[PDB]
Structures are given as structure tokens and as C-alpha cells.
Scaffold this active site. Structure first.
Site, PDB file in Angstrom:
ATOM      1  N   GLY A 147       0.819  -1.202   0.000  1.00 54.15           N
ATOM      2  CA  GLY A 147       0.000   0.000   0.000  1.00 54.15           C
ATOM      3  C   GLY A 147       0.850   1.248   0.000  1.00 54.15           C
ATOM      4  N   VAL A 148       0.200   2.420  -0.025  1.00 58.87           N
ATOM      5  CA  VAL A 148       0.882   3.714   0.030  1.00 58.87           C
ATOM      6  C   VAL A 148       0.558   4.368   1.378  1.00 58.87           C
ATOM      7  CG1 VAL A 148       1.162   6.004  -0.998  1.00 58.87           C
ATOM      8  CG2 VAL A 148       1.043   3.980  -2.472  1.00 58.87           C
ATOM      9  N   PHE A 185       3.852   8.793   4.194  1.00 59.17           N
ATOM     10  CA  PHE A 185       4.850   9.513   3.390  1.00 59.17           C
ATOM     11  C   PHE A 185       5.594   8.675   2.308  1.00 59.17           C
ATOM     12  CE2 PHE A 185       4.704  11.744   7.617  1.00 59.17           C
ATOM     13  CZ  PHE A 185       4.166  12.948   7.210  1.00 59.17           C
ATOM     14  N   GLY A 186       5.114   7.470   1.991  1.00 59.60           N
ATOM     15  CA  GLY A 186       5.736   6.647   0.954  1.00 59.60           C
ATOM     16  C   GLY A 186       5.127   5.280   0.732  1.00 59.60           C
ATOM     17  N   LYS A 187       5.561   4.589  -0.349  1.00 62.59           N
ATOM     18  CA  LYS A 187       5.117   3.228  -0.704  1.00 62.59           C
ATOM     19  C   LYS A 187       5.629   2.230   0.337  1.00 62.59           C
ATOM     20  CE  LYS A 187       5.467   2.227  -5.451  1.00 62.59           C
ATOM     21  NZ  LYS A 187       6.370   2.069  -6.628  1.00 62.59           N
ATOM     22  N   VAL A 188       4.859   1.165   0.592  1.00 64.14           N
ATOM     23  CA  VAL A 188       5.251   0.100   1.517  1.00 64.14           C
ATOM     24  C   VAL A 188       5.273  -1.190   0.710  1.00 64.14           C
ATOM     25  CG1 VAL A 188       4.818  -1.087   3.713  1.00 64.14           C
ATOM     26  CG2 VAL A 188       4.320   1.353   3.492  1.00 64.14           C
ATOM     27  N   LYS A 196       8.964   0.551   4.193  1.00 63.60           N
ATOM     28  CA  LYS A 196       8.419   1.874   3.866  1.00 63.60           C
ATOM     29  C   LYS A 196       9.543   2.675   3.194  1.00 63.60           C
ATOM     30  CE  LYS A 196       5.930   5.799   6.073  1.00 63.60           C
ATOM     31  NZ  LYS A 196       5.683   6.422   7.407  1.00 63.60           N
ATOM     32  N   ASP A 245      -5.023   9.384  13.635  1.00 69.85           N
ATOM     33  CA  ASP A 245      -5.320   8.555  12.436  1.00 69.85           C
ATOM     34  C   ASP A 245      -5.313   7.035  12.746  1.00 69.85           C
ATOM     35  OD1 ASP A 245      -5.795   8.231   9.425  1.00 69.85           O
ATOM     36  OD2 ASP A 245      -3.669   7.602   9.393  1.00 69.85           O
TER      37      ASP A 245
END
Ligand code: HU7
Ligand code: ADP
Ligand code: AMP
Ligand code: AMP
Ligand code: CL
Ligand code: CL
Ligand code: CL
Ligand code: CL
Lengths: 161, 283, 366
Positions: free
Chosen positions: C15-16, C19-22, C37, C131
Site C-alpha cells: 500500500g501507500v 509519506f511513501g510506498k510500503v 516503507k 489517524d
């Protein structure tokens, strides 16, 4: 020695990375979407590289270049010690109306048998905030709660004016 | 040497409670307002801050009230004019004239043995715990608190035979003794409490330095002509010499008192064993 | 031709994140799976979060809770920063609730205890994970909760409040959607309350396509309680989903609740004053009144917000610098109060702070 990321951001059927670090041999880059990448260990120093994007030789224009005496234009990379350590890398990287009063600050520990020396444990949020009593008989009473290590102290100063 | 080593290990910080209240007076504060503040805040001692000197100069206690009262009382017909209009510094200048005394304090990081020795060494009951890095006073260490923690470790891990405390030239008062006279005895002898004796040597009650704040509280300080018993009407633990020291220490904390009176087989006074003496012997 | 970081071969994107792609990482030799990450150095400085990431890494490195994703190591490169963390096969708790329906009382209770244990661990370590949603609660092979996106988390600092409205509107607290100041833990309790409702019902307590009515529903605190819901849990949801943060449950209040206490495993838990001075003048008049009085005392300062001042003083005796922070808040629709806060760095620091305040109070209104 230190891992370095080589990312080509564009389209392509086949993209290769040639560099001083691999005797200019064509290394293939894996594609995710519009990015072609290769992570490889590099000895901390100066390295020159170029890309072989679909039958054409190029450099990444956004990356630093080096024009040669013979007119050759290759990208350049200066591998730093600070690039390999997390916090060294993050240290180098860093270079109307008034708000409504939060109800938390109205929750005093002085007002809310037992011991008079002892008080309830305060919410971190009301620590270091100045509280005061109405100046009765020309003497001001000021109070604040502060924490020393894992314990808290509510000091109240009797000061005349 | 068993309990003695235990005190040399544990830091003063270990005895500071999780959430405490500290009352501090500016030397420029009127001294009557200062005693009334001790009463209203329910605190027995309060450090003093000199604004011009920008440091803690001393401490205001009930002894200070006993000293003003006895020194300046004239009669119930006249006001104690000075007490009424005197600042803490104005009085501390008179009280500590040529005979000057500096501030005695302990660091929270310093050992319990360092604090116990400092209490006897300077002949004091209230010790301020000041952090050197901040300069802030955190807690006021009392004999009652130190002997409370040491009682918890004594449980988990005779009086005549050991002979602990003062048994000769004991300062005592009679039932009829006026408050002013008692205050004078508290001054000349420098003792925390005076046992109230009957027609015969037998002990009936005990008037302590603490019972003197009731005069500040009830605003009854202007009449010191009243008897010690009359003053104690606003509200007695005795021990014998055939009782063990461990049982004597156990009986003290069970009622949470500052001293035990040594009474004979016919309820008459023989001596006194105070918290100052117990902690002196265990050092 | 496989992409490698550490000795793990980088694969499919999970997923995204914030603060970045995982992406998944599978070890060359052992086949051990990790989640990586990828934070681009140039991108994290673009949306100035270099400090946020520095703190995030610092916290997650020293954490160790069975229901919070472990950050194994951070690999730094000239180009990017790689956060190597523990991988869980079960994926999103949200997707679980989508595929399968609502969880039964026993199942919901188990998962809620695990989630709350973690939310507590965070708070105990002065970290508030804003969150908090089923989309950010991951499940392992054995159905164990795992809190995962600490991108929007923040520190709880002695004497300060937070402002940033962070999470998804559906899970955000009324004060968060109202953009008001908060302490931190209360907004996590609200989110956890919504997570509990999601577990028991399979739906959201506050949800509407019309955004204004959704925001009204949240601030009104009114949500539907289906008939299958046990009154004891309705009691807990009522206590957790209070619009008044002062009337809202605390981890202790929850820990003490009879529904939470049930079958709770041992391993989960380890067991006449006034603020400042109030002046009814216009906010900017108050700011002119304070500045003219601060300089009158010969104190140095720096103006942060039009209602935030960071004042300094040189001690004429100890020759030490003593600093305090002044902030104006709005109390009534008619009154405003000035708050005095001591900022941590001889004589007493605490008493020096009182004298600093006292001087300014003498030349001011109520
Ligand atoms: C081809 O790249 C990869 N492929 C891998 N496999 C499994 C084949 C593994 C790792 C990467 C990788 C990706 C990135 C990256 C990235 O994808 O950044 C995105 O770039 C997009 C763009 O520029 O279009 C923006 O839209 C968007 O926001 C932004 O996250 C940034 N730094 C990276 C470093 C590595 Cl090693
Ligand atoms: N830290 C200190 N430094 C200097 N003098 C002190 C200190 N603390 C108390 N004093 C003085 O010691 C004297 C006796 O006080 P104290 O034993 O504390 O009385 P009390 O029995 O009410 O506790 C008083 O004159 C008081 O001013
Ligand atoms: N009534 C008293 N007469 C004589 N000495 C006393 C009396 N009360 C206390 N002492 C002594 O005074 C010292 C300090 O004790 P205290 O002030 O009672 O905490 C100790 O050595 C006590 O034995
Ligand atoms: N030996 C004693 N036996 C019983 N009560 C005592 C004794 N000594 C002091 N008190 C009481 O303790 C109070 C005074 O407090 P303090 O000086 O702190 O011990 C008064 O209520 C006294 O009656
Ligand atoms: Cl996502
Ligand atoms: Cl696989
Ligand atoms: Cl798993
Ligand atoms: Cl859902």
C-alpha cells in the site's frame, strides 16, 4: 560497501545502467510502473554512470552531470559517509483570531481526612502553566505544577506587591 | 550497622511523593500573613525566597511563631504590634542578629544517611530537598517520613537496656502553667514538646510546638495568659523501660507521633525518646 | 535482476502509507518477510517532514508491544530512507470486516483489548497515534491486532497542546473536525471507540455521503445502536464517544469497565484559583499592552503567532537566562485570557518564573 539506489523515471521496454563501478557493463533495471530501479553497493567515492534507455544512451537531467574533454556527458555521484547513516542523513536533509481555551487548563489539582501536602497526579498538558489567586490584602499568590523526573511538585509563592 | 548501610544507599528522591505541594514565602511578606498561610495551606514549614539575593535564605517554621510570641508579648490588653506589622526579613534580622545561620539543604540524588546525619549535625527537624541543576525546592524531608520508610524495611527484614534519648534535666509544664511561660521554656530549652504534669509527678497531657499553630488558626494568640490545658481544649501515648526498641519504634509509627514519653509504674515522667534520637542511634 | 535492500528482495507494494510506498521484502536465504516503507529524501524535505520522520523513527525503534508493528531497522541511502518493519499476512482489519461481517461479542472484545493495549503503550510512551482506523490496524496469521501507520502520530510534551486535524473524518474526534486544540490521548480514545463500533456492527457510527451532515452527527455525538448490541458495550461506547473531551473516557475508565474486563488476558496490561489573567479588550489591544510592558521590564522576545510570544530575561544576580511562553486564548464570546507557560532551560528556575509573571500582571487587567 554502501547501498545506492539508481532510479530511471520514464517509460521503456528495456533500460540498462552503465557505470565506472561495473566497467560500463549494461546492468538491467527492474520496472515497477514509470520507474526503473537497481540498488547496488558502492565504494564511497566518485562514480560516473549513464543509462541505456530503449536503444538510446542518456543521463538523468535532474541528476548532476560531468562534461568531458572528449565531449562525453555522464551523470556523477559522490557517495558520502553521511548518506549511509539514518540520523546523519536526516540532519544534513534539514538544509487570524486567538485559539479557543482548551478545557484541560481549567482542571486544577489545587481545588480538586487526607494529607494537605499531597495532591492528585496532573495531566502533562497543565504542567508549567501559571495559576493565581485574587490579590487580597495587597499580596499576590502565584502557583504552578512542574515535574522533576517521575515526580511532580506544585509550588505556590506568597509574594507581596 | 545493618540499617545504617541501608540509608547510605537509597537516594532522597525515593522519599519524595508522586504529587506534592510546596509553599514558598518572599522575605518581603508580612510575618503574620506568613503564619496564617502555613495554617491555611496545611503546611508546617515553608522556604523563604529573598528577591534581592535571588536565593533561598532560610525556612519559616512554628518555632519562629513561638519565638515572636514569647519575645514580643506584653499582655492580652495590648496588640503584639510587631507580629502585626513586621516582614519576615525584618524579624529574621532581629532573631538572627550577630548569631547568623545559613540554609541547610540536601540534593535528591544524595543518600538518606547524608540527610539523617545533616538533621542531627545542624539540630533540625525540617530539611529542604533542592535539585542543584534547577535550583528548585521539591520536598521538605521530615523525621516522621524517614522513620516511616525505614519501618517498612525493618518489618520485612529493651528501652532501659539500650538507653536511647534524654532522661535527665527534662523540660516539663504543669496543668495550670500559662502558654507564655510554656513558650519561654520552648525557647530556653530548645525542645519540640513539653509534657503536662499533674499535682504529683504523674503525666496527664502534652503541649507540643504543633499545638501553638492553633493560636494562629483560631486567631487566639493575643491571650497567652491562658493555661496549657485551656489551650489544649481545642482537641496520651506513653511507653515503659521494660519494652523493646523494635516495639517502641512500631508503637510510634502506628499512631504517627514525633516522640514517646518514658513513664514509670505509677504514670510519672522519667524521660523522653524522640524521633531525632532513634535516627541518631541508627547512624 | 531482483531489487534488494538489506538481504531482503523487494517485491509487491502492500500500500501507500503517510509519506511513501510500503513494499514486501523476502529474505534471500531464510525467506523471512518484512514490510519496507520507502521514504525519498528529496520528497520528505519538499513537504517539510524531516523532523516528523526523525521523531517517528526514534519512537518506533524503542517501542516493543505485541500489537504495534515492530520497526526492525532503518537503512539509509543517498537517494532514499528504507524502514524495515514486521510483516503481517492478514492485511487490513477493515478488509476483514468487509469480507466477513461484524465480529461477534467475544471476537470484538478480544481484538478491542489488543488494540487498546497498544494505544495505551503509545500514550504511556508520550506518543499519540492520530489517524487510528481499521485500515491502519493490521491482522497477523493468528488474528492479532497490529497498529501500523505512525506517519500522523505526535509527541505529548509537558505543558503543550496539539492543533493538526489528522485522521479520516469518520474516525476523527469532534474537536479534531472543529480544528480546536487537544491534549492528544482523548482523540485516540474517540478513534478507538469508532473502531469498537466497527468491530461490533460492521458499519460506522458516524457516516454520511453529505459531508456537512456527517460533521454535524460527529459534533452532536448521536449514533445508532443496533438491537444486537449488549447494553454493557453501549455503556462503554457512550462513555468513549462523548463530544466533551472532559466528560470522555480515559484508558483507566475503559480498563475499569465491566465489558472490557471480561476474559481480558494478563499479558496485555502491566498492573479559588484562576489560570493567567483575563482581559475583555480586543485581542490586538492586549498584544499591544503586553509588548509595551515586556519591553518596559527590559525583557527580550520573539513573536511566533500574532497571539504567541517567546520571552527571555537576564537575571541581575545569577547572570542566568530565564525564558517563558505567553499565549492568548479566547474564553467567552466576550472575554480573552493570557496564559503563562515556563519553558525548560544558581537560584530557583520555578520562583524566577513566578517573579517574571508577577511583574507583567501588576501592569495589566484582571
Ligand atoms: C522501480 O522502483 C522500485 N521498484 C521496486 N520493485 C519491487 C521492482 C522496488 C523499489 C522501488 C523503489 C521505488 C521508489 C520510489 C517511488 O516509486 O516513488 C514514486 O514515484 C512516483 C513518480 O515519480 O511517478 C510518484 O508518483 C510517487 O508519489 C512516488 O512514491 C521512490 N524511491 C524509490 C526507491 C525504490 Cl528502490
Ligand atoms: N534549612 C534551614 N536553614 C536554616 N535555618 C533553618 C532551616 N530550616 C529551619 N531553620 C530554623 O530552624 C529553627 C528551628 O526549626 P524547626 O526545628 O524546623 O521547628 P519545628 O519543630 O516546628 O519543625 C527555626 O529558627 C528555623 O528558622
Ligand atoms: N521535654 C524534653 N526535655 C528534655 N529534652 C527533651 C525533651 N523533649 C525532647 N528532648 C530532647 O531534644 C532532642 C530533640 O528532640 P525533639 O525536639 O523532641 O524532636 C532529643 O535529644 C530529645 O531527647
Ligand atoms: N507522647 C505523646 N503521646 C501522645 N500524643 C502526643 C505525644 N507527643 C505529642 N503528641 C500529640 O501530637 C500532636 C503534636 O504534634 P507533633 O509535634 O507533630 O508530634 C498533638 O496533638 C499532641 O497531643
Ligand atoms: Cl493505501
Ligand atoms: Cl511469496
Ligand atoms: Cl503472519
Ligand atoms: Cl467497516
Amino acid at each position: 560497501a554502501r547501498p545506492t539506489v539508481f532510479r530511471w523515471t520514464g517509460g521503456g521496454k528495456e533500460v540498462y545502467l552503465s557505470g565506472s563501478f561495473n566497467n560500463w557493463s549494461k546492468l538491467p533495471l527492474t520496472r515497477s510502473q514509470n520507474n526503473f530501479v537497481a540498488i547496488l553497493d558502492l565504494p564511497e567515492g566518485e562514480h560516473q554512470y549513464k543509462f541505456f534507455v530503449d536503444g538510446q544512451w542518456t543521463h538523468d537531467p535532474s541528476e548532476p552531470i560531468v562534461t568531458s574533454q572528449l565531449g562525453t556527458v555522464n551523470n556523477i555521484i559522490q557517495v558520502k559517509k553521511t548518506d549511509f547513516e539514518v540520523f546523519d542523513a536526516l540532519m544534513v536533509d534539514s538544509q487570524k483570531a486567538p485559539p479557543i481555551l482548551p478545557p484541560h487548563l481549567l482542571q486544577v489539582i489545587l481545588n480538586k481526612s487526607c494529607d494537605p501536602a499531597l495532591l492528585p497526579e496532573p495531566n502533562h498538558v497543565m504542567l508549567n502553566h501559571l495559576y493565581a489567586l485574587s490579590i487580597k490584602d495587597g499580596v499576590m499568590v502565584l502557583s504552578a505544577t512542574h515535574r522533576y523526573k517521575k515526580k511532580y511538585v506544585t509550588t505556590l509563592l506568597y509574594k507581596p506587591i | 550497622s545493618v540499617y545504617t548501610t541501608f540509608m547510605k544507599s537509597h537516594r532522597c528522591y525515593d522519599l519524595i511523593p508522586t504529587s506534592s505541594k510546596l509553599v514558598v514565602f518572599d522575605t518581603s511578606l508580612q510575618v503574620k500573613k506568613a503564619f496564617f498561610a502555613l495554617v491555611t495551606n496545611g503546611v508546617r514549614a515553608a522556604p523563604l525566597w529573598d528577591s534581592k539575593k535571588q536565593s533561598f535564605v532560610g525556612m519559616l517554621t512554628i518555632t519562629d511563631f513561638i519565638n515572636i510570641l514569647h519575645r514580643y508579648y506584653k499582655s492580652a490588653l495590648v496588640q503584639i504590634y510587631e507580629l502585626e506589622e513586621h516582614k519576615i526579613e525584618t524579624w529574621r534580622e532581629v532573631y538572627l542578629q550577630d548569631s547568623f545561620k545559613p540554609l541547610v539543604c540536601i540534593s535528591p540524588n544524595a543518600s538518606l544517611f547524608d540527610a539523617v546525619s545533616s538533621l542531627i549535625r545542624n539540630k533540625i527537624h525540617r530539611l529542604p530537598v533542592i535539585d542543584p541543576e534547577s535550583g528548585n525546592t521539591l520536598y521538605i524531608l521530615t523525621h516522621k517520613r524517614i522513620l516511616k520508610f525505614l519501618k517498612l524495611f525493618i518489618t520485612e527484614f529493651s528501652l532501659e537496656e539500650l538507653q536511647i534519648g534524654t532522661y535527665a534535666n527534662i523540660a516539663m509544664v504543669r496543668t495550670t502553667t500559662p502558654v507564655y511561660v510554656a513558650l519561654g521554656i520552648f525557647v530556653q530549652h530548645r525542645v519540640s514538646a513539653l509534657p503536662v504534669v499533674d499535682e504529683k509527678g504523674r503525666v496527664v497531657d502534652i503541649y507540643s510546638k504543633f499545638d501553638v499553630i492553633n493560636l494562629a488558626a483560631e486567631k487566639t494568640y493575643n491571650n497567652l495568659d491562658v493555661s496549657v490545658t485551656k489551650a489544649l481544649q481545642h482537641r496520651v501515648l506513653k511507653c515503659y523501660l521494660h519494652e523493646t526498641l523494635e516495639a517502641i519504634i512500631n508503637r510510634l509509627v502506628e499512631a504517627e507521633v514525633h516522640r514517646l514519653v518514658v513513664v514509670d509504674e505509677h504514670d510519672v515522667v522519667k524521660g523522653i525518646v524522640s524521633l531525632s534520637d532513634i535516627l541518631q542511634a541508627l547512624v | 535482476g531482483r531489487v534488494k535492500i538489506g538481504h531482503y528482495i523487494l517485491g509487491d507494494t502492500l500500500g501507500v502509507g503517510t509519506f511513501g510506498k510500503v513494499k514486501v521484502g523476502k529474505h534471500e536465504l531464510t525467506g523471512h518477510k518484512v514490510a519496507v516503507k520507502i521514504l525519498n529524501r528529496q520528497k520528505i524535505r519538499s513537504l517539510d517532514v524531516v523532523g516528523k520522520i526523525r521523531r517517528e523513527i526514534q519512537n518506533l525503534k524503542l517501542f516493543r508491544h505485541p500489537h504495534i508493528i515492530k520497526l526492525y531497522q532503518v537503512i539509509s541511502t543517498p537517494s532514499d530512507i528504507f524502514m524495515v518493519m514486521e510483516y503481517v499476512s492478514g492485511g487490513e482489519l477493515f478488509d476483514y470486516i468487509c469480507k466477513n461481517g461484524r465480529l461477534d461479542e467475544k471476537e470484538s472484545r478480544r481484538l478491542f483489548q489488543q488494540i487498546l493495549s497498544g494505544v495505551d503503550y503509545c500514550h504511556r510512551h508520550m506518543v499519540v497515534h492520530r489517524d487510528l482506523k481499521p485500515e491502519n490496524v493490521l491482522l497477523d496469521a493468528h488474528m492479532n491486532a497490529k497498529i501500523a501507520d505512525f506517519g500522523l502520530s505526535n509527541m505529548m510534551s509537558d505543558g503543550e497542546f496539539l492543533r493538526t486535524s489528522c485522521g479520516s473524518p469518520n474516525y476523527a474526534a469532534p474537536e479534531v473536525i472543529s480544528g480546536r486544540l487537544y491534549a492528544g490521548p482523548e482523540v485516540d480514545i474517540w478513534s478507538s471507540g469508532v473502531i469498537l463500533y466497527a468491530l461490533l456492527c460492521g458499519t460506522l457510527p458516524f457516516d454520511d455521503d453529505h459531508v456537512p451532515t456527517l460533521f454535524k452527527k460527529i459534533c452532536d455525538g448521536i449514533f445508532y445502536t443496533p438491537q444486537y448490541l449488549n447494553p454493557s458495550v453501549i455503556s462503554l461506547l457512550k462513555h468513549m464517544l462523548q463530544v466533551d473531551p472532559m466528560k470522555r473516557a480515559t484508558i483507566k475508565d475503559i480498563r475499569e469497565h465491566e465489558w472490557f474486563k471480561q476474559d481480558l488476558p494478563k499479558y496485555l496490561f502491566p498492573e479559588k484559583w484562576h489560570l493567567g489573567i483575563r482581559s475583555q479588550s480586543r485581542p490586538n489591544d492586549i498584544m499591544a499592552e503586553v509588548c509595551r510592558a515586556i519591553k518596559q521590564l527590559d525583557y527580550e522576545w520573539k513573536v511566533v503567532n500574532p497571539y504567541y510570544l517567546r520571552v527571555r530575561r537576564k537575571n541581575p544576580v545569577t547572570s542566568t537566562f530565564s525564558k517563558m511562553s505567553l499565549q492568548l486564548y479566547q474564553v467567552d464570546s466576550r472575554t480573552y485570557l493570557l496564559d503563562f507557560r515556563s519553558i525548560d532551560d544558581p537560584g530557583s528556575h520555578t520562583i524566577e518564573f513566578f517573579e517574571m509573571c508577577a511583574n507583567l500582571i501588576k501592569i495589566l487587567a484582571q
